[PDB]
């Protein structure tokens, strides 16, 4: 995986952020929202 487009280091960071960190954070926050009592 490499790119010659401008700032090709951005998919290096953003694809782990969008597909690992963001879903784990959103599923974590949605777990708190749908399982909180009262």
């Amino acid at each position: 995986m490499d790119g010659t487009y401008a700032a090709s280091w951005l998919p290096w960071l953003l694809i782990p952020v969008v597909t690992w960190l963001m879903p784990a954070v959103v599923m974590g926050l949605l777990f708190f929202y749908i399982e909180s009592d009262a």
Binding site: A24, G28, F31, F32, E35, S36, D37
Partner: protein, 144 residues
């Protein structure tokens, strides 16, 4: 009620399971989580070492098993921690004599223990496999 079986009426099974660190009487919750974490992070390095993507990668044949076990211990810690936050009540809002893993501070003590044991058990297994040629010289006496 329940069944009377030669597994349920087995005294070795009840003494083994009852003295696993989840159940062993008199343990603090931080120590329960620590012993559970050290066992679990240690074996979790192994699978990606032998059959993973970095098994034929000469610069770092062991890095894939370490970061796999770290991220599994991360999601295991966060899932265990989020579980106690939604399921349990603190020690103030419970009765006395309330079985500390059934309180939220005791469960989160166990969660902190699982993280610390899990990552460091994973780093321990990674460290021995990374230094395996020097462990092998120790175990064979090539260091004299």
């Amino acid at each position: 009620g329940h069944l009377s079986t030669p597994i349920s009426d087995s005294a070795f099974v009840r003494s083994f399971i009852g003295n696993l660190p989840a159940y062993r009487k008199g343990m603090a919750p931080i120590t329960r989580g620590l012993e559970i974490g050290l066992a679990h992070g240690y074996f979790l390095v192994g699978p990606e070492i032998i059959v993973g993507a970095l098994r034929d990668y000469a610069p770092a044949p062991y890095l894939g098993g370490l970061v796999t076990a770290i991220a599994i211990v991360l999601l295991g810690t966060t899932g265990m921690g989020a579980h106690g936050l939604v399921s349990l009540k603190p020690v103030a809002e419970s009765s006395p004599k309330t079985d500390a893993l059934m309180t939220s501070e005791g469960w989160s003590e166990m969660t902190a223990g699982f993280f610390l044991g899990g990552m460091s058990g994973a780093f321990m297994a990674y460290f021995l496999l990374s230094h395996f040629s020097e462990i092998d010289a120790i175990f064979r006496g090539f260091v004299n």
